Amino acid sequence: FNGLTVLPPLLTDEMIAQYTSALLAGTITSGWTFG
Amino acid sequence: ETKCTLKSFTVEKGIYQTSNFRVQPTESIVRFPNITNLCPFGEVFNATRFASVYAWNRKRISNCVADYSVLYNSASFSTFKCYGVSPTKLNDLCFTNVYADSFVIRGDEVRQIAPGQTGKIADYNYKLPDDFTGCVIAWNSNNLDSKVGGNYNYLYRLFRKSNLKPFERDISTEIYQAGSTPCNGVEGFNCYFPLQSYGFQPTNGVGYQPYRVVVLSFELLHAPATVCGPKKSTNLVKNKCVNFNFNGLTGTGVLTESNKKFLPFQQFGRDIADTTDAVRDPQTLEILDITPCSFGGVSVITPGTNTSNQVAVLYQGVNCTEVPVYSTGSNVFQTRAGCLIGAEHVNNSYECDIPIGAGICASYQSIIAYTMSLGAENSVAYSNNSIAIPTNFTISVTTEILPVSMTKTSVDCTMYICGDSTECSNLLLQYGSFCTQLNRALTGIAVEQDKNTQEVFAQVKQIYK
Amino acid sequence: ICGDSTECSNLLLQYGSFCTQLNRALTGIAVEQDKNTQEVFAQVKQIYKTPPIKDFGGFNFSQILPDPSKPSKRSFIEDLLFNKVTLFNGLTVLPPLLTDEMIAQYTSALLAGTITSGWTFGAGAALQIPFAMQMAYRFNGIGVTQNVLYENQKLIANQFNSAIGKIQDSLSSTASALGKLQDVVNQNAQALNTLVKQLSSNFGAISSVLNDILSRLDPPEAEVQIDRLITGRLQSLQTYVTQQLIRAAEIRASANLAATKMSECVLGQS
Amino acid sequence: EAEVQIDRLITGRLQSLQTYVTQQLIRAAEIRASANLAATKMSECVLGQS
Amino acid sequence: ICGDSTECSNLLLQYGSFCTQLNRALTGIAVEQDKNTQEVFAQVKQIYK
Amino acid sequence: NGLTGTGVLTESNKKFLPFQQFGRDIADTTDAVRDPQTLEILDITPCSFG
Amino acid sequence: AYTNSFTRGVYYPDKVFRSSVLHSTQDLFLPFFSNVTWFHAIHDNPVLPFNDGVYFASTEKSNIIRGWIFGTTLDSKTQSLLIVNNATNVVIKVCEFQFCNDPFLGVVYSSANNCTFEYVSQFKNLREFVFKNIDGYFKIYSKHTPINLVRDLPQGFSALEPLVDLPIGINITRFQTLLALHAYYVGYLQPRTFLLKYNENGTITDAVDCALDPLS
Numbered sequence A: 001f002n003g004l005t006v007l008p009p010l011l012t013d014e015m016i017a018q019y020t021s022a023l024l025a026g027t028i029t030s031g032w033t034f035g
Numbered sequence B: 001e002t003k004c005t006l007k008s009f010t011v012e013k014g015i016y017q018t019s020n021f022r023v024q025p026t027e028s029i030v031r032f033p034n035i036t037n038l039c040p041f042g043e044v045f046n047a048t049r050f051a052s053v054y055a056w057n058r059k060r061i062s063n064c065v066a067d068y069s070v071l072y073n074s075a076s077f078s079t080f081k082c083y084g085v086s087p088t089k090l091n092d093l094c095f096t097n098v099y100a101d102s103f104v105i106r107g108d109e110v111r112q113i114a115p116g117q118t119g120k121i122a123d124y125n126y127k128l129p130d131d132f133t134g135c136v137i138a139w140n141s142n143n144l145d146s147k148v149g150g151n152y153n154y155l156y157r158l159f160r161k162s163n164l165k166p167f168e169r170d171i172s173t174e175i176y177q178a179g180s181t182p183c184n185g186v187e188g189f190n191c192y193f194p195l196q197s198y199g200f201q202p203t204n205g206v207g208y209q210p211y212r213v214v215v216l217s218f219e220l221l222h223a224p225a226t227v228c229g230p231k232k233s234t235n236l237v238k239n240k241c242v243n244f245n246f247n248g249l250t251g252t253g254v255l256t257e258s259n260k261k262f263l264p265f266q267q268f269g270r271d272i273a274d275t276t277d278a279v280r281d282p283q284t285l286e287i288l289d290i291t292p293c294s295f296g297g298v299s300v301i302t303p304g305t306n307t308s309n310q311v312a313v314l315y316q317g318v319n320c321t322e323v324p325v326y327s328t329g330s331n332v333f334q335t336r337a338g339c340l341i342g343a344e345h346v347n348n349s350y351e352c353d354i355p356i357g358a359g360i361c362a363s364y365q366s367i368i369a370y371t372m373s374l375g376a377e378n379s380v381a382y383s384n385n386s387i388a389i390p391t392n393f394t395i396s397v398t399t400e401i402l403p404v405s406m407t408k409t410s411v412d413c414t415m416y417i418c419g420d421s422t423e424c425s426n427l428l429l430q431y432g433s434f435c436t437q438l439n440r441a442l443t444g445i446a447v448e449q450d451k452n453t454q455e456v457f458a459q460v461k462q463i464y465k
Numbered sequence C: 001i002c003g004d005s006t007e008c009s010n011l012l013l014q015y016g017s018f019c020t021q022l023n024r025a026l027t028g029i030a031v032e033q034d035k036n037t038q039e040v041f042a043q044v045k046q047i048y049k050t051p052p053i054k055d056f057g058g059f060n061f062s063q064i065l066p067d068p069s070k071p072s073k074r075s076f077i078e079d080l081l082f083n084k085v086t087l088f089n090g091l092t093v094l095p096p097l098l099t100d101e102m103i104a105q106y107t108s109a110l111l112a113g114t115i116t117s118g119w120t121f122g123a124g125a126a127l128q129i130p131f132a133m134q135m136a137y138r139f140n141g142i143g144v145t146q147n148v149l150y151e152n153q154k155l156i157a158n159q160f161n162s163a164i165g166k167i168q169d170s171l172s173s174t175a176s177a178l179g180k181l182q183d184v185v186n187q188n189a190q191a192l193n194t195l196v197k198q199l200s201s202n203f204g205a206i207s208s209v210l211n212d213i214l215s216r217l218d219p220p221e222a223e224v225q226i227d228r229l230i231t232g233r234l235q236s237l238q239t240y241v242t243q244q245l246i247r248a249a250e251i252r253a254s255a256n257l258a259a260t261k262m263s264e265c266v267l268g269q270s
Numbered sequence D: 001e002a003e004v005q006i007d008r009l010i011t012g013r014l015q016s017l018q019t020y021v022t023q024q025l026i027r028a029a030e031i032r033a034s035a036n037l038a039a040t041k042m043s044e045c046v047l048g049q050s
Numbered sequence E: 001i002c003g004d005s006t007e008c009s010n011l012l013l014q015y016g017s018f019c020t021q022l023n024r025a026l027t028g029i030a031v032e033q034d035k036n037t038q039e040v041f042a043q044v045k046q047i048y049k
Numbered sequence F: 001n002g003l004t005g006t007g008v009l010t011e012s013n014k015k016f017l018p019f020q021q022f023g024r025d026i027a028d029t030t031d032a033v034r035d036p037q038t039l040e041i042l043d044i045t046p047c048s049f050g
Numbered sequence G: 001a002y003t004n005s006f007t008r009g010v011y012y013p014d015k016v017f018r019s020s021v022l023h024s025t026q027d028l029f030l031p032f033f034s035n036v037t038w039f040h041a042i043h044d045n046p047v048l049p050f051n052d053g054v055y056f057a058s059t060e061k062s063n064i065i066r067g068w069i070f071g072t073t074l075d076s077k078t079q080s081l082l083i084v085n086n087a088t089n090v091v092i093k094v095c096e097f098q099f100c101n102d103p104f105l106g107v108v109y110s111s112a113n114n115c116t117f118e119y120v121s122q123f124k125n126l127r128e129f130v131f132k133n134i135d136g137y138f139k140i141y142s143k144h145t146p147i148n149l150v151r152d153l154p155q156g157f158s159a160l161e162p163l164v165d166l167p168i169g170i171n172i173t174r175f176q177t178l179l180a181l182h183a184y185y186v187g188y189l190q191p192r193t194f195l196l197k198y199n200e201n202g203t204i205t206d207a208v209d210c211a212l213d214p215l216s
């Protein structure tokens, strides 16, 4: 580079996908009682 | 031009701003006071009689408007050369004051009038100072001085060892008898009159014919200016983009008649922020107006490079009658937001996709510009004993996109402005703590982005399958 | 910063391409405000019209419905609001995309829809319903049984008419109730005025007019004078742009809040 | 004279950096507001009924 | 920026009126903060015990 | 040949026409250059930092 | 004797027309509610210092106050300004003059050594004058229209408009009024800051001090 840089994100994309899958499975099976 | 301002070879559908246009000026007008205080230079050069070389007359001139061009072209002068000052530009020079010295000499004594020179009259009658003198003007005077002039009326001073200070006169008529030891060891003898008479005859040659010589001396930057050369003027024009120079106040714009009233002692009016709005010409003493010449940015509306290769160009906020293929192009349509050329105007109205303004916008069916439509139209049959109850139902699915974070970036502080140099780093120390202040904010922003993402996504404590 | 001067532009073209971002920020905020007004007011897919005959169970909406004899086809309260508040050196003010007539038509359509149909027009097709049976639903929503309404209709109608008359009179007479809009207009006008006024400052040079110092000296120090004037004017312009950006962000937040309030309260019940 | 030259370069680059930092701060604030709105929407409309 | 010197004031009055909008912004944010806390806490008309 | 710099040199893979002398990508960053003696093209890149 | 000057002493500062604009200026003005040295030279004209411009007034509607002699030594050594009246024209002579004990004038002359410049121009009545010297320029502002707001005292609001300007460029530190052989106020002025309100026709209709009162 020439003085500038880009840091990587803390949360990888697979972790985000797992969060979305967990939320969706929870809202399919339990409804809204798990909140 | 759109591709230039976009720096790409493909342009999508929409409206872009390329550049701006202005109306160029055509001619210039300059005005100055109607009157011109003439300076009576006639009595100086055309005086009946002049004094002697040892008793020259000094006359004072001030608060004058004197023109040297009217005298520069005159051929009635034997010689007119000026030292350190261009005569041709003397019409555009302001000096504090002017001194005039007129007299008459012999033919060969013309060269004696110059600074840093040696001679009988150069050092004994009139000495030029060791600096710039205005200049000397000399002309022949054999008609009135070598034919009818007095035989002894002109006198010089043969008094040596008395080098006079510049601009000094010694009119004291004292017989030069030393009366002491350094004159033949006698007192009273060797007595010579300090003055002696010129010897002239009618047409006796060129070095003996008396010539009129006048020295004019200028002063600059000693006091507020009192004498200046005359300034020319011209006529005036109306309803044109012109640059004006009204007696010092310069500017550009268009001139129009005005109905405002000025008290008899103001010069130019204004409204706010030092913006001149009315000037009165000195010759006519009529009130006028100033309006800035029309200008503004241009815009290009295109349906996209892929679909077509035709655009329409719009001028913003210009009542375009002075519009100079698209110099005139297709039909001109003047709207509330300027004027558009390149698209025909239709009479119907549909939905809008490429907004223009003032309720109108254009679309590609050629390109057609019309008025925005608010939607469909229907009237419900309201009554006081009627209701509508649905009998069937549908289920729909929609979408909604929301950003939550942006790319985290960091910028090195000294590296960007130094490039690995010791001198730059050493001289960056004198600017205080700018470096740390700039560096802290980016880290704070990155931490904020991390916290933002973690908070927005992490809402469950377990993982379900 | 130049005023159509050659050497001024020659000296200016060596300070980088700042004008690109200077113009792009203003264009972005203009598009942002256009989107703001579009999202606030465009909330109906059709344009309903009030029935020619009006019998709303005794209520009287004459002072709120549009008057078909006005030059702009606006109701009384809108005219009072319009009449209440009241407010060029290379800078221009662009006209808005949506004119007054379109806004008036949008408000008229929204009012007609919320009067004739109720909340059903905000979730599909409009459905006719008598006004009394809508007031019954709206009372039943807040816990009060519908039996109260049908036996106390005249009292409610009289109270509503008296309240609307009182609020109309208060708007007509009492002033200084519209501080926010006047404050915004005054702030914008004052910022523009001081930006214009910043030209006359000397900035440490010989004079505040370019051509005079250009026509009284030689370029060796004229360059320094022009550089000083240019950098001062650039700093002033940067400060003005920053203030404009801050104000635009605040206005965006306020517009978003207003849009949420209008979408929730008007189209249904809170 | 190198001091004068580097002073000119340094001040110009400092103004550019200041402008960039301010623009990034404004954009970050706007993005934070939008993400807060998104978080509220997801917390309300998913784990329950609106 | 100077601390009681005249030559400053002479030089600084030539730079324009930056301090005007500086003080205006500071006073504006102060008044806005006061109104903010007043609106947050003052939500009742009477006092109960 | 008067062009000063700091970085690591490598044999280049790009092709110069017989009349250039060097090359760049963005904003005066000299990426390649041909030596004035052997007439061989080389590429220049700064070494690691972070 | 001392007299309270209510609100007099406001003049047009420049040659710029304005309309319906509140303009704040910083210039040499007479402070509001000041004290002026009332004189009673009636059966008595001492020399008063100049001190950066002077106010002047009068209340007698006839030709008794004639001239104002200026200078720094009032002798032939240094040039002295003379501005005198003739009931048909006003003449100004800056040429050097010698001392005079009790000058008399009305419709003294000692010498004219080194003459340099000359100028020729054109209830009771109030004659208000303001004399100023800035960057070598001599300025005289005058007003001749009286208003009887109150009697025996000069109360009311009136503007002063310029008449002439002289590019003399001389030092003035001393002046004296001239009389004849057989009640004028004098005041000094200070560099104040004023606010001025202009009518729609460009006439000053109201002035406000900026260093007098908290309301101001």
Ligand SMILES: *[C@@H]1O[C@H](CO)[C@@H](O[C@@H]2O[C@H](CO)[C@@H](O)[C@H](O)[C@H]2NC(C)=O)[C@H](O)[C@H]1NC(C)=O
Binding pocket: B034, B283, B284, B285
């Ligand atoms: C300006 O100079 C010209 C040159 O003679 C004159 O203009 C005349 O002014 C009188 C009024 O004084 C008009 O009636 C004439 O129509 C003008 N033109 C001519 C050709 O006579 C006059 O000397 C000056 N005008 C002023 C001072 O208003």
Ligand SMILES: *[C@@H]1O[C@H](CO)[C@@H](O[C@@H]2O[C@H](CO)[C@@H](O)[C@H](O)[C@H]2NC(C)=O)[C@H](O)[C@H]1NC(C)=O
Binding pocket: B041, B042, B043, B044, B045, B046
């Ligand atoms: C001195 O007198 C001569 C006499 O001829 C003046 O010459 C004038 O020149 C102009 C221009 O050609 C003529 O129109 C006049 O008719 C001439 N005579 C007069 C009396 O003006 C000359 O201009 C005079 N110069 C000075 C300085 O007095």
Ligand SMILES: *[C@@H]1O[C@H](CO)[C@@H](O[C@@H]2O[C@H](CO)[C@@H](O)[C@H](O)[C@H]2NC(C)=O)[C@H](O)[C@H]1NC(C)=O
Binding pocket: B319, B321, B334
């Ligand atoms: C643009 O300027 C022209 C004048 O050049 C205006 O034309 C006017 O048109 C009306 C109606 O045809 C006439 O009564 C006027 O006399 C015209 N003006 C002049 C000066 O003669 C035109 O209206 C302007 N357009 C806009 C939108 O303002």
Ligand SMILES: *[C@@H]1O[C@H](CO)[C@@H](O[C@@H]2O[C@H](CO)[C@@H](O)[C@H](O)[C@H]2NC(C)=O)[C@H](O)[C@H]1NC(C)=O
Binding pocket: B391, B392, B393, B394
């Ligand atoms: C409500 O609408 C649905 C369609 O949206 C109707 O279902 C259709 O019925 C017809 C006639 O039997 C079938 O040919 C279609 O295939 C059905 N559509 C689907 C998607 O299954 C339904 O009958 C309607 N209900 C009423 C009471 O009219």
Ligand SMILES: *[C@@H]1O[C@H](CO)[C@@H](O[C@@H]2O[C@H](CO)[C@@H](O)[C@H](O)[C@H]2NC(C)=O)[C@H](O)[C@H]1NC(C)=O
Binding pocket: C060, C061, C062, C063
């Ligand atoms: C609704 O209220 C408006 C209030 O202005 C009524 O308009 C006036 O009503 C009074 C008495 O009802 C009349 O004397 C006036 O002549 C009316 N003025 C106008 C301009 O119409 C209106 O009548 C009311 N409508 C109903 C149905 O009661």
Ligand SMILES: *[C@@H]1O[C@H](CO)[C@@H](O[C@@H]2O[C@H](CO)[C@@H](O)[C@H](O)[C@H]2NC(C)=O)[C@H](O)[C@H]1NC(C)=O
Binding pocket: C155, C158, C159
């Ligand atoms: C409830 O309050 C309303 C209004 O305050 C009362 O209605 C008023 O009754 C008095 C007495 O009959 C009348 O003079 C007023 O004109 C009425 N006002 C209106 C707007 O109609 C009502 O009587 C109250 N009811 C009870 C049970 O107290």
Ligand SMILES: *[C@@H]1O[C@H](CO)[C@@H](O[C@@H]2O[C@H](CO)[C@@H](O)[C@H](O)[C@H]2NC(C)=O)[C@H](O)[C@H]1NC(C)=O
Binding pocket: G136, G169, G170, G171
């Ligand atoms: C007023 O008097 C002062 C001296 O007390 C003048 O100042 C000097 O003026 C001469 C001009 O002949 C200069 O050469 C000196 O350099 C000046 N000295 C100083 C210290 O200023 C001043 O010029 C006089 N003012 C007027 C208008 O004549």
Ligand SMILES: *[C@@H]1O[C@H](CO)[C@@H](O[C@@H]2O[C@H](CO)[C@@H](O)[C@H](O)[C@H]2NC(C)=O)[C@H](O)[C@H]1NC(C)=O
Binding pocket: G199, G200, G201
């Ligand atoms: C400014 O000048 C105008 C024009 O003379 C004045 O307007 C006149 O005002 C008087 C009474 O004030 C009326 O009798 C005239 O009919 C008006 N004439 C016109 C043409 O309007 C105005 O009063 C002046 N304003 C001042 C002096 O403040």
Ligand SMILES: *[C@@H]1O[C@H](CO)[C@@H](O)[C@H](O)[C@H]1NC(C)=O
Binding pocket: B306, B307
């Ligand atoms: C142009 O539009 C056509 C029609 O959709 C599409 O097939 C094509 O890929 C587009 N080309 C470009 C360069 O966008």
Ligand SMILES: *[C@@H]1O[C@H](CO)[C@@H](O)[C@H](O)[C@H]1NC(C)=O
Binding pocket: B345, B346, B347
């Ligand atoms: C639209 O049609 C009407 C009806 O004749 C006509 O008066 C009007 O001028 C038309 N508009 C345009 C833009 O041609």
Ligand SMILES: *[C@@H]1O[C@H](CO)[C@@H](O)[C@H](O)[C@H]1NC(C)=O
Binding pocket: G002, G033, G034, G035
């Ligand atoms: C004027 O002088 C009198 C008496 O000396 C005094 O009472 C009064 O306060 C003075 N007024 C001013 C404004 O100085």
Ligand SMILES: *[C@@H]1O[C@H](CO)[C@@H](O)[C@H](O)[C@H]1NC(C)=O
Binding pocket: G084, G086, G088, G089, G091
């Ligand atoms: C006064 O006027 C008379 C006649 O008008 C004249 O002779 C005399 O020279 C004038 N004196 C002065 C001092 O102006």
Ligand SMILES: *[C@@H]1O[C@H](CO)[C@@H](O)[C@H](O)[C@H]1NC(C)=O
Binding pocket: G114
């Ligand atoms: C007259 O005054 C001028 C003023 O500059 C001076 O130069 C000149 O010497 C004086 N002449 C006499 C004779 O005193």
